[model samples]
Target: GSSGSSGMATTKRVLYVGGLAEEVDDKVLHAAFIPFGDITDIQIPLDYETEKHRGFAFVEFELAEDAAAAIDNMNESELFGRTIRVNLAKPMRIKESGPSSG
Candidate 1:
């Protein structure tokens, strides 16, 4: 569920975002779409050592309908002095856990 925020329906689409400014944060990402729908999470990749944003992020919505509306509205919206790219992320495949064998 959207947690009763923004009045948008629940969504489950995760968007792969790029072209974000270095200064952008999860709060800003959430605010950008608050007008369109409710967001569940804003996950920006971080550098392992630096512990900073890696110039990209993933946003999860409570429902696919809300996500789709946001994608259409914010695909090229300006944020942090740059146009952000928002779209559905491809699913990741699971890999077998094992050590290399000869």
Candidate 2:
């Protein structure tokens, strides 16, 4: 639970990133996003059967504004030779637990 950070803490700033190449990982994301802002944490799901990355990841930022900027420039910005998808992954708390409206 990356549930603790004591700054302005405007938002958790979780980015659901997909369309990434198999080579991309926490290091790649860290390097890429560090240019934009500070990172809180990064997590990539693993495929236990293959014991490799599931091809998508989630990243957290210290500032919510940084993530907004990342999405604008990072979306369709080829990284690892593939266009990556970026979107707000989850909310800090339950806004409304159901099918995503957007």
Candidate 3:
């Protein structure tokens, strides 16, 4: 989420598509989400040692509304012979620890 002086709610356009089949790639993933709206980016991370897709992907749409629809309709949908799950991408949150007592 973004927080700034603009005082507007942060919109999340990235969708996490999981439960992917082993053979799916960026092209296939794009095809899955294309009907929703214009895509800004797609990332399918790979295992460092094997160089294989991590069985999931992050799809970024130009509009947050499109991403919301994709998540609502695409979750539990069949893709590549597997049931896929879709949701808003949740970034890891970092916590700030207070000063330690001496």
TM-score of each: 0.75, 0.72, 0.77
lDDT of 2 by residue, 2-101 (tens): 4554544445488888898878999999998899899889988886687688678998988888988998888778887788998878554656667776
Candidate 3 clashing pairs, residues 3+ apart or interchain? none
For every candidate in turn, the CA RMSD to the true structure comes to: 7.7, 9.4, 5.6
Predicted structure 3: lDDT: 0.84
lDDT for each candidate structure? 0.77, 0.82, 0.84
* lDDT per residue (tens digit) for residues 40-83 in model 1: 77787787799897677888887788888888878887887788
| Model 3 spans with C-alpha error above 4 angstroms | 1-11, 93-102
Regions more than 4 Å wrong, model 2: 1-12, 90-102
Clashing pairs in 1: 10-62, 10-63, 11-61, 11-62, 11-63, 12-62, 12-63
lDDT (C-alpha) at residue 56 in model 3: 87
